[PDB]
Structure formats: structure tokens, C-alpha cells
């Protein structure tokens, strides 16, 4: 899919330092994923970080990153959901 592109540019848009910030924050819901929280909790991880994922929008991303055959979201693949939304708050 064309997501493999926004997966590397989603975290590269900033310095690796920030990525470490989303670690303790993104892992806040990785009690059973470790490197990926339930797509349902994908709105709180990016929202509690300082952004605001809308349901209609958060739903399009989940179903989009959920059809990968995993059911949840990956850290690197989730980054896009961070900058893409922070693009306005940043």
C-alpha cells in the first residue's frame, strides 16, 4: 500500500528525540501489544500527546491501519497519526 511511505516520513519529520517522547506516551496502552496499542485506543495515545483526533477522522485512520491484518496500530506506522494531526497543533 502507499502507507509504507508515510510510515518513514511520519517520524522523520522531526528529530529522533521526539520519537522517544511518543514511546512512554504511546506505550501507555501497550499492556498487551508492547509495540502497538488497540486501534480503539489509538485516539487517546495521539490525543493525550497534545492533539485531538476526531471520531470521523480517527475512524478513517483505524480502519485504514486496521486492515493491515493486525487489528492494532504499530508505533512507526502510528507516527503518521501523530504528525499528521500535530501538523495543525505543531
Domains of the chain: 1-90 (1.10.238.10)
Determine whether the annotation assigns residue 32 to a binding site.
yes
Determine whether the annotation assigns residue 30 to a binding site.
yes
* Buried/exposed 39-53: b ≥16 CB within 10 Å, e otherwise: bebbbebbeebebeb
Determine whether the annotation assigns residue 44 to a binding site.
no
Determine whether the annotation assigns residue 70 to a binding site.
yes
Amino acid at each position: 500500500a502507499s502507507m509504507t511511505d508515510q510510515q518513514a516520513e511520519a517520524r522523520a519529520f522531526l528529530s529522533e528525540e521526539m520519537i522517544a517522547e511518543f514511546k512512554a506516551a504511546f506505550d501507555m496502552f501497550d499492556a498487551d501489544g508492547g509495540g502497538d496499542i488497540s486501534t480503539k485506543e489509538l485516539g487517546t495515545v495521539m490525543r493525550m500527546l497534545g492533539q485531538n483526533p476526531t471520531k470521523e477522522e480517527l475512524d478513517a485512520i483505524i480502519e485504514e491501519v486496521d486492515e493491515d491484518g493486525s487489528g492494532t496500530i504499530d508505533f512507526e506506522e502510528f507516527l503518521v497519526m501523530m504528525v499528521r494531526q500535530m501538523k495543525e497543533d505543531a
